């Protein structure tokens, strides 16, 4: 197997065939401009084009000093042209293809998404909103793992920027993990309430419950009154319903990632707040 | 005239205890050094107050074995500074005993030996007791043998080595420790008496009728053989009156310094009443492979030297008559460039037994010392077990971790291959 097969190996977007086809198409006297034209014709993806150019420069012996220099210049030009669009996407080729398979989507689409995400400073919330508008909650977590794989792999690039984006994506993941906690426990709570003849808001789902939980923890100055208030606004005024949710929020607090708390004190303060709310909704035993 | 005994590791310390218990009985010294009242002074210094103190040093990298000597019946026999211990043992790893742990204690041991040497008017040499299989017995002994060669140049160094035996053996790595120590000790020992635990174990079972012999059973048997070898040095003798006389009479080729000791009679205490064995009978038994303390066949090899050390009610004419019968009846083939003779020694002091002890009191006994090429059979057993493990480099990482480069293993084996070829070359 040649360099073309080595390049095509694991690469779901390039065949050794098209690469050899490209190398064979490029004559020894091909100018840097000629090379790029040919690369562009057979390969539309800049990442794959840049990959092809690496293949081409690399598959060319130093004996063909003129061609290799033309190919090098072509690649240098292509890199000058695309920069990150080519190089960054090329860097995360494996990751994009792997997750494209899990999501049953296009790898280029994921690379585009990645570059989009990494092209600027984005907070966790910006990322969350950016993903919920594009994916199912089920798929979002998987997408977040692609982005994380890509950013980690970019240890070869907006260094400082990616570090911040990774911190923001980890926050996003921590939030999603919290939503998963509610996903499994909310039905149990609602079924147990239902079993005791307690009618609950028909639309009440884990997301609404989880969102209420996060409004509480992210509250700038939370109180037991605010806690109870949000819970009552959430599930209604049934003592067992309010108690159930407050108990769920209290259970959730212990399981929520530390990164989602401004300090260790914040977590304890929230617990105390929830406990006080539970006591307020238990006076009449 | 003086000899300093060095007891290294558990096997050495515990054999030394059995030896000194016997030496004391043999010379009529109580365990407090007092003697209710000169030959034995080569092994015991004499104090004006009454005390006879063993010219001995006891070393172990772990305290537990020597702590028992320090609190034992013989606690007042030795001065405490003669009993030296570390804190952590060599964990059956030669490299720990030689490099890692040994390096810490070596300087102290040497200074204590020097303090003993400075109380000698004419130090003959050293008698070193140790096991092959233990990390301290193998690793620390070779370190010490190397350093003694420097400090006491032209002084004899005689060993009593415990050749490992599966029955009692506590470590898988004992073949490695045995080859490694014998490689580094080879050019620093002048004579080495190997004691194969399987042979001593088999004698206890067969002769002494002990079904499952303990180290205590074995040690009392080893110390009878050790006593027979050193009797010449502790009593006014004619043969082997010197540590140097040992080499001259038993070591014609210098790498080939491993004589095979054979002792007779070894009668059970349970047996008496029984008819006492004659000079002819006890001599005949020396040529029986059952009575050898290393398992091998001399009827497969050739002799280089042969010493007969008698003890008790033995008459010179009876010895000559007994030897004559053995020359005419047995196949005692000597190497082509050696003497066809048997060096004989008689010590009219009867054999001493330990009151209680599994062994019975005898009227006459003999310990024959032979330098046969047949001892290479025991080297080959060890070399094979070493080969099987080294091919897969099993357990080697333990040694490399403890300041030993892997190459020392191959070098050691190469010296063993050479020793095996040397015993082969003698056979012509």
């Amino acid at each position: 197997t040649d360099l073309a097969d080595k390049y095509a190996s694991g690469n779901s977007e390039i065949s050794g065939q098209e690469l050899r086809g490209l190398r064979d198409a490029i004559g020894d006297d091909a100018s840097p401009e000629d090379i790029l034209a040919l690369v562009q014709e057979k390969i539309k993806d800049p990442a794959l084009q840049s990959t092809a150019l690496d293949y081409l420069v690399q598959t060319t012996p130093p004996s063909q000093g003129k061609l290799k220099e033309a190919l090098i210049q072509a690649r240098n030009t292509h890199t000058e042209q695309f920069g990150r669009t080519a190089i960054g996407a090329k860097n995360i080729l494996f990751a994009s293809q792997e997750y494209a398979d899990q999501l049953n989507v296009s790898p280029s689409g994921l690379r585009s998404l990645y570059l989009e995400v990494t092209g600027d400073t984005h907070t966790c919330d910006q990322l969350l909103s950016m993903l919920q508008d594009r994916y199912t909650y089920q798929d979002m977590a998987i997408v977040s793992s692609f982005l994380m794989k890509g950013m980690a792999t970019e240890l070869k690039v907006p260094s400082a920027q990616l570090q911040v984006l990774m911190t923001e994506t980890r926050n996003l993941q921590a939030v999603l993990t919290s939503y998963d906690y509610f996903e499994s426990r909310v039905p149990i709570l609602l079924d147990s309430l239902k079993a005791e003849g307690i009618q609950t808001p028909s639309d009440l789902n884990f997301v609404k419950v989880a969102e209420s939980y996060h409004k509480i923890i992210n509250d700038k100055f939370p109180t037991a009154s605010k806690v109870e208030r949000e819970v009552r606004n959430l599930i209604g005024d049934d003592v067992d319903s309010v108690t159930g949710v407050l108990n769920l929020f209290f259970s959730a607090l212990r399981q929520t990632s530390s990164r989602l708390f401004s300090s260790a004190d914040k977590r304890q303060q929230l617990g105390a707040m929830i406990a006080n709310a539970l006591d307020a909704v238990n006076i009449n035993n | 005239r003086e000899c300093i005994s060095i007891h290294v590791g558990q096997a050495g310390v515990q054999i030394g205890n059995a030896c000194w218990e016997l030496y004391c009985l043999e010379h009529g010294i109580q365990p407090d050094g007092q003697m209710p009242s000169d030959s034995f002074n080569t092994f015991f210094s004499e104090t004006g107050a009454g005390k006879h103190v063993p010219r001995a040093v006891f070393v172990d990298l772990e305290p537990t074995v020597i702590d028992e000597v320090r609190t034992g019946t013989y606690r007042q026999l030795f001065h405490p500074e003669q009993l030296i211990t570390g804190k952590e043992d060599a964990a059956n790893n030669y490299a720990r005993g030689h490099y890692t742990i040994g390096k810490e204690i070596i300087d102290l041991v040497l200074d204590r030996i020097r303090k003993l040497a400075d109380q000698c008017t004419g130090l003959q040499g050293f008698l070193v007791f140790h096991s092959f299989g233990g990390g301290t017995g193998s690793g620390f002994t070779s370190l010490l043998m190397e350093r003694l060669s420097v400090d006491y140049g032209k002084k004899s160094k005689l060993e009593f080595s415990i050749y490992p035996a599966p029955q009692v053996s506590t470590a898988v790595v004992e073949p490695y420790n045995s080859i490694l120590t014998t490689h580094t000790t080879l050019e620093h020992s002048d004579c080495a008496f190997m004691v194969d635990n399987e042979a001593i174990y088999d004698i206890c079972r067969r002769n002494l009728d002990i079904e499952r012999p303990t180290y205590t059973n074995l040690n009392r048997l080893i110390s009878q053989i050790v006593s027979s070898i050193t009797a010449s040095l502790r009593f006014d003798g004619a043969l082997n009156v010197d540590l140097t006389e040992f080499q001259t009479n038993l070591v014609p080729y210098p790498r080939i310094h491993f004589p095979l000791a054979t002792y007779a009679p070894v009668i059970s205490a349970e047996k008496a009443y029984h008819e006492q064995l004659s000079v002819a009978e006890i001599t005949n038994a020396c040529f029986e492979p059952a009575n050898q303390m290393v398992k091998c066949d001399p009827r497969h090899g050739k002799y280089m030297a042969c010493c007969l050390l008698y003890r008790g009610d033995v008459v010179p004419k009876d010895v000559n008559a007994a030897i004559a019968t053995i020359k005419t009846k047995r196949s005692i083939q000597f190497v082509d460039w050696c003497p066809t003779g048997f060096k004989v020694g008689i010590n009219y002091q009867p054999p001493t037994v330990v009151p209680g002890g599994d062994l019975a009191k005898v009227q006459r006994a003999v310990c024959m010392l032979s330098n046969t090429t047949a001892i290479a059979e025991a080297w080959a057993r060890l070399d094979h077990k070493f080969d099987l493990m080294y091919a897969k480099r099993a357990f080697v990482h333990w040694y490399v971790g403890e300041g030993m480069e892997e190459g020392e293993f191959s070098e050691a084996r190469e010296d063993m291959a050479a020793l095996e070829k040397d015993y082969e070359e003698v056979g012509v």
Binding site: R170, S258 | A171, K392, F395
Partner: protein
């Protein structure tokens, strides 16, 4: 070469760890107050290995009790021997990793670790000559797995010259219904293969199968599994606690059991399981697949090294004979290139309730079956890139999953090479 420092992490670690203390304390004649009320002087001979002496000759365990889950403090304290433990030796957190390895190894666990290391330091100073450390934990959880393996690495950097030995409870679908267990077990195996000198593989699959198949218990609880763990732990530490020649310290056992540094995972076995048994019947049962605490068929591999411990008053002539027959009759299952690899030890003090017992420690190339079971369970999840955000969110990265996967598959391949290795 004297004192051992015991550490128990997580729910499983503390449960199995407390039954271990209950068992050996009763063996050494110690009551939950730490007062010796024994029968033999042998009980106090090597007592300084696991116990420290207080004024009043109150023997206290050299045990460090850790969990990020605060509830485990009370579980231990309210247990039978719960009083015996040093109150300063309870290092407990505010959370409980919730089966997340990253939480125990990087976040919540790494916060508590320094406080644990302070307790390990103070127990290691009041040690004349420290042998090493012994950790009891489950690989399936978050604290026992993540924090436990963080501790192992942190202790190895502080006490590099000491032996690190563990009792690691392998997860099983038959026992725990938690999905992410193969991740936590694969991420821990990765650490253990590089940071421990000897690991006893207590497989929950074998424990369940013994209770279910052999003991006939149709619905086994943790209590029933733990009865087997306590008995196994009591037997494998017998040569350490009572006077002896063979395997007396952690390093002597290591030098005899570990031919290759990575191949240090042991298959513990014990006979009899239920409660008029002869030495041949004991030898026969102790080797039997049905009695191994790790779900591996010995017939699927070869034994590199074996340690057989007989407890009770029996013939040593019989044990030497039976162990020799078990080898010459079953020659092909023992590695040809490691001569005299099966070392047998006799202790006259039997375990409570038995007049005669046998404990087996095997380093069999058949342990690869156990790792393969975890790798198969892991691959199937990591394929779908499942639950990855729970771990990556806590700080760790995907590469650590791929590194743990490769390292465990290299371990299985390594076992296989010596299984097939021709003398």
């Amino acid at each position: 070469m004297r004192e051992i420092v015991h550490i128990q992490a997580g729910q499983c670690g503390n449960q199995i760890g407390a039954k271990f203390w209950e068992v050996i304390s009763d063996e050494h004649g110690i009551d939950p107050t730490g007062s010796y009320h024994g029968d033999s002087d042998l009980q106090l001979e090597r007592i300084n290995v696991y116990y420290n002496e207080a004024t009043g000759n109150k023997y206290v365990p050299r045990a460090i009790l850790v969990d990020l889950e605060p509830g485990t403090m009370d579980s231990v304290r309210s247990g039978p021997f719960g009083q015996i433990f040093r109150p300063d030796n309870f290092v407990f957190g505010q959370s409980g990793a919730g089966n997340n390895w990253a939480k125990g190894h990087y976040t919540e666990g790494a916060e508590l670790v320094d406080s644990v290391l302070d307790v390990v330091r103070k127990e290691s100073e009041s040690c004349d000559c420290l042998q090493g450390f012994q950790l009891t934990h489950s690989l399936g959880g978050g604290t026992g797995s993540g924090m436990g393996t963080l501790l192992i690495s942190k202790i190895r950097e502080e006490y590099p010259d000491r032996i690190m030995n563990t009792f690691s409870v392998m997860p099983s679908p038959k026992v725990s219904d938690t999905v992410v267990e193969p991740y936590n077990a694969t991420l821990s195996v990765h650490q253990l293969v590089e940071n421990t000198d000897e690991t006893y593989c207590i497989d929950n699959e074998a424990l369940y199968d013994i209770c279910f198949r052999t003991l006939k218990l149709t619905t086994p609880t943790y209590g029933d599994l733990n009865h087997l763990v306590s008995a196994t732990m009591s037997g494998v530490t017998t040569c350490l606690r009572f006077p002896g020649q063979l395997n007396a310290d952690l390093r002597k056992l290591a030098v005899n059991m570990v031919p290759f540094p990575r191949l240090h995972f042991f298959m513990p076995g014990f006979a009899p399981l239920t409660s008029a048994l002869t030495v041949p019947e004991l030898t026969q049962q102790m080797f039997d697949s049905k009695n191994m605490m790790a779900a591996c068929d010995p017939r699927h591999g070869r034994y590199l090294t074996v340690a057989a411990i007989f407890r009770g008053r029996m013939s040593m002539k019989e044990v030497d004979e039976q162990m020799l027959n078990v080898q010459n009759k079953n020659s092909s299952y023992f590695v040809e290139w490691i001569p005299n690899n099966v070392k047998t030890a006799v202790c006259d003090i039997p375990p409570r309730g038995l007049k005669m017992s046998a404990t087996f420690i095997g380093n069999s190339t058949a342990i690869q079956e156990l790792f393969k079971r975890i790798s198969e369970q892991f691959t199937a999840m990591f394929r779908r890139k499942a639950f990855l955000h729970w771990y990556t969110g806590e700080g760790m990265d995907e590469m650590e999953f791929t590194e743990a996967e490769s390292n465990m598959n290299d371990l299985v391949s390594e076992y296989q090479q010596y299984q097939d290795a021709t003398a």
